[PDB]
Design a protein around this ligand. Structure first.
Ligand code: RET
Ligand code: RET
Ligand code: PLM
Ligand code: PLM
Ligand code: PLM
Lengths: 246, 245
């Protein structure tokens, strides 16, 4: 109903306000914590020798955390004018796909650096393939309705989506570890929680397109997504905050 | 026409054979050259320090070459029994997409390792995002025809596609170079040649769905893909062969 549409304008505006408040809070309180992006270039032939790692760029973590919070705050304020409905008049939500393409990619990169993924190409590619996951979900919503035909776009998203995490799992397990590799307790919590949040985002899409009575109303799904952006970003933002100090 | 389809059954079988002959050549003559995939794991917390880089897995390059050649050989022989024909009886070719999803990801990973990219997660991710490019192109053929709405999967693919080349450029330019860094001339040849070949694959897809007079025959596009797959995989296979042996 349009009455639900109206509640969504108010709902988004509040979601944005919470993201905005936390963004400012982090900006006020966070220290100057930075993580490295490096390159290990060749000293010659491909399989002969490598030049020692050079730090190309560093990531100001507090600003980066504020950044993905800022992206949600911003997009919710844009949406609050009723534009997402104006783009309907099932529904489709491009605003969300653009927002997530940016913010979920910003934050998966943070998680990687936290694990120890320093290489600049790795972090770039992870950002790219995470964006692909979001863009596949967008294509699901663009070309199909809640019917059998939505399978592929979704599952292509799952393929692009699962990879980043597999990379993290490699570093968490550390196949080449020589016993001096310790992963912090707060890191393990960040990975698990955020992984479980990413799974629920996939779950919303699935159920929404599967068509379960409850989720036959697109707007229940829309609202559930908005909460997940809010809860998952908050969770990571304050876990990293606490962990930076720990 | 169905006549053209039968011609394509032969054309694939011949292309497959050309891929197979080059595969077996490499397997016969190639060295035991291999490139490392590494992990540089943290010792402690994020901002402390790192443990020495460890080689997790090394890539047998000759075999990796035979792998993307063989995969093409394999799918061309499969197709040659007249399976893809059902899309005519613009069409679709998911044998292409399944094949390319694998074989071109194998070969882009090789190029990365040739450039000095060794981080196992980087190479994992590059592979993943290259597959995403192919899968976007698949979706272009699945849900669209020669109409405006065809563009979006294509452009999503272009984005996912360029990300690997951006990474390669980082290692070629070497922003943090301290003057001891050097890249072999043959690597510049590999990158430029294959980069143009990857661009032309997109060019075909574009012109085919753009509906340019010539390319309004879907099977003309198909023939282009068969030739490009052959030449681009060949070009890389032998440039690597020359440079590693
Ligand atoms: C702050 C916003 C966040 C963390 C949004 C994350 C979005 C997801 C993890 C979406 C994932 C999807 C799948 C895994 C399958 C394809 C459909 C999506 C885009 C809903
Ligand atoms: C051996 C086969 C190879 C090297 C195939 C390469 C395929 C591509 C580079 C396809 C690229 C595409 C775009 C860049 C846009 C999206 C559509 C595609 C898949 C045609
Ligand atoms: C399209 C993404 C490019 C990157 C920068 C985008 C900044 C966000 C702009 C808001 C997009 C909201 C949806 C707009 C829908 C439309 O294009 O008509
Ligand atoms: C994970 C699935 C979450 C589904 C949504 C849970 C309730 C969130 C608040 C909904 C408010 C509403 O629908 O009006
Ligand atoms: C390496 C030199 C070229 C290899 C030649 C491969 C030929 C494969 C195609 C088989 C031709 C027979 C096709 C049967 C029907 C027909 O000719 O129309």
């Amino acid at each position: 109903t349009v009455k639900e549409i109206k509640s969504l304008q108010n709902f988004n505006r509040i979601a944005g306000v919470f993201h905005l408040l936390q963004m400012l809070a982090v900006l006020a309180l966070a220290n100057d914590f930075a993580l490295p992006m490096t390159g290990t270039y060749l000293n010659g032939p491909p399989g002969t020798t490598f030049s020692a790692p050079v730090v190309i760029l560093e990531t100001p973590v507090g600003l980066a955390v504020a950044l993905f919070l800022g992206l949600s705050a911003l997009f919710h304020f844009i949406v609050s004018s009723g534009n997402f409905f104006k783009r309907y008049s099932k529904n489709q939500n491009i605003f969300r796909w653009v927002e997530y393409s940016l913010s979920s990619s910003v934050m998966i990169v943070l998680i990687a650096q936290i694990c120890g993924i320093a290489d600049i190409v790795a972090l770039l590619a992870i950002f790219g393939v995470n964006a692909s996951m979001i863009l596949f979900g967008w294509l699901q919503e663009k070309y199909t309705q809640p019917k059998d035909g939505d399978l592929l776009p979704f599952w292509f998203g799952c393929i692009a989506g699962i990879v980043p995490w597999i990379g993290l799992l490699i570093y968490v397990i550390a196949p080449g570890s020589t016993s001096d590799v310790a992963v912090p307790g707060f890191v393990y919590g960040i990975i698990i929680s955020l992984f479980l949040f990413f799974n629920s985002f996939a779950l919303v899409q699935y159920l929404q397109y599967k068509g379960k009575g409850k989720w036959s109303n697109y707007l229940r799904g829309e609202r559930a997504y908005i909460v997940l952006s809010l809860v998952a970003k908050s969770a990571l933002a304050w876990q990293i905050f606490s962990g930076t100090l720990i």
